[PDB]
Design a protein around this ligand. Sequence first.
Ligand SMILES: Nc1ncnc2c1ncn2[C@@H]1O[C@H](COP(=O)(O)OP(=O)(O)OP(=O)(O)O)[C@@H](O)[C@H]1O
Ligand SMILES: Nc1ncnc2c1ncn2[C@@H]1O[C@H](COP(=O)(O)OP(=O)(O)OP(=O)(O)O)[C@@H](O)[C@H]1O
Ligand SMILES: C[C@H](N)[C@@H](N)CCCCCC(=O)O
Ligand SMILES: C[C@H](N)[C@@H](N)CCCCCC(=O)O
Ligand SMILES: [Mg+2]
Ligand SMILES: [Mg+2]
Lengths: 224, 224
Amino acid sequence: SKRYFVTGTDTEVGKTVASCALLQAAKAAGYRTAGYKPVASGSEKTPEGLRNSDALALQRNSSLQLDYATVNPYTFAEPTSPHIISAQEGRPIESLVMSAGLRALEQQADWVLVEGAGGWFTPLSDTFTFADWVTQEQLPVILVVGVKLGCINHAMLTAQVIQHAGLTLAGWVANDVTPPGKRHAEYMTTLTRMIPAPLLGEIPWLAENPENAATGKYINLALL
Amino acid sequence: SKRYFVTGTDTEVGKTVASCALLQAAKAAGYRTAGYKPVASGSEKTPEGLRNSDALALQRNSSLQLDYATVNPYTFAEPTSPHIISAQEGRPIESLVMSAGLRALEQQADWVLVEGAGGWFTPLSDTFTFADWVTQEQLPVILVVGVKLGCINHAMLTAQVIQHAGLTLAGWVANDVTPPGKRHAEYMTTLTRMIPAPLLGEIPWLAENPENAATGKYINLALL
Ligand SMILES: Nc1ncnc2c1ncn2[C@@H]1O[C@H](COP(=O)(O)OP(=O)(O)OP(=O)(O)O)[C@@H](O)[C@H]1O
Ligand SMILES: Nc1ncnc2c1ncn2[C@@H]1O[C@H](COP(=O)(O)OP(=O)(O)OP(=O)(O)O)[C@@H](O)[C@H]1O
Ligand SMILES: C[C@H](N)[C@@H](N)CCCCCC(=O)O
Ligand SMILES: C[C@H](N)[C@@H](N)CCCCCC(=O)O
Ligand SMILES: [Mg+2]
Ligand SMILES: [Mg+2]
């Protein structure tokens, strides 16, 4: 079944918004979809335990009705690097558990999207990063680029490292994190030339609740 | 004579503030110093033409009295990627001119610091990036890390790419861009373990005019 890992040029660049757009587009194409956020930090308390907003957005945007834990096995309240809070709370993040969770979603979905945490190299322990897991799984990677000053360097750095790891950069998504700026078009042309992967689509600047905006239309799944 | 290229995990992470600290420390050590900002964007008009604040900070912090043009040959008013504004204004950025400017400073200084623009991969033309020039010059690189969420990934990405290019990562500087946060110490430990270069020093959060604060004391030049 189809599976993709979604990373970003940094934390807060739009991985979640783009992932929802990707999920909506797959559903529109006829796929039985599932979003997976194996490791999450920055979560709120609820009667059922801790709940992460990214995990909730991916869960809502999946065509299948999924249990929270199936979408997000590891939930930490504090919004910091996974490895720091995991060590402080004494709750190890295990590659095997993250991989088991992906297989579990594949029991019912034929199109799975995996959102990472932060950027490419976000640590999970003192000796293991998210990149290590993505490489282990041999997941094709989709790069979400928040269009802003500094994004060219970050996109280039991330694309080079992904390719070096022997992984496939399946595509990139341009996300308009802010209203139209002076050099928007020039940045889009530069990004298009430099990222060795197809531009899947561009998500407009959607001020109000973009996680729940109908954004699937901005993604051309046939380029993936 | 000694020469170092200063890059950062992104634009606006403190390359200029750290460069001033580095320059002050070298001067304290007895060196005849010179800061060099070959390419600059985001500049103000003056009676003498355009003037960039980074270039002005490096000029002020050099032990030698340097002419503005010697410090910054290429000055663009608009604060965007060098390649975009250079093309729009029809003023090509030439590797040869940038290299000639470095040699010119070396006529009088025995310790030269070169501040890049933006991050590692900032484009200078449609086919040439700053990284290309740094590689051509075989300059040892100092990585400035603005201590904040997302910096681990960026530091790791930049360090890997620099090493891959066959260049020497001479050291890194931790810059406190914001007041003390919850996981400061844990981030410093993670950064120290992961960056394959000596931590040269840490610049405290200095709210008021940090470019002109006495920061040389935070750098241990003997580790460089
Ligand atoms: N296209 C957009 N238009 C308007 N706002 C956006 C857009 N994309 C993202 N945002 C907003 O910017 C913020 C960051 O986006 P998002 O949560 O998707 O990023 P992220 O990369 O998933 O971050 P994290 O590393 O926490 O997983 C959010 O508040 C989001 O609502
Ligand atoms: N240690 C610090 N304490 C307080 N403020 C700081 C500190 N370092 C940097 N700043 C502020 O943060 C901003 C960015 O820093 P700086 O100009 O040194 O970054 P930069 O990486 O040189 O950016 P550019 O890519 O434009 O060259 C500036 O307004 C600066 O005054
Ligand atoms: C305006 C800004 N401070 C410039 N001096 C450097 C910006 C370069 C950004 C390049 C990129 O998008 O990676
Ligand atoms: C709190 C934040 N939104 C997290 N979900 C992801 C942050 C990871 C940052 C890791 C790093 O410093 O590179
Ligand atoms: Mg997210
Ligand atoms: Mg600067």
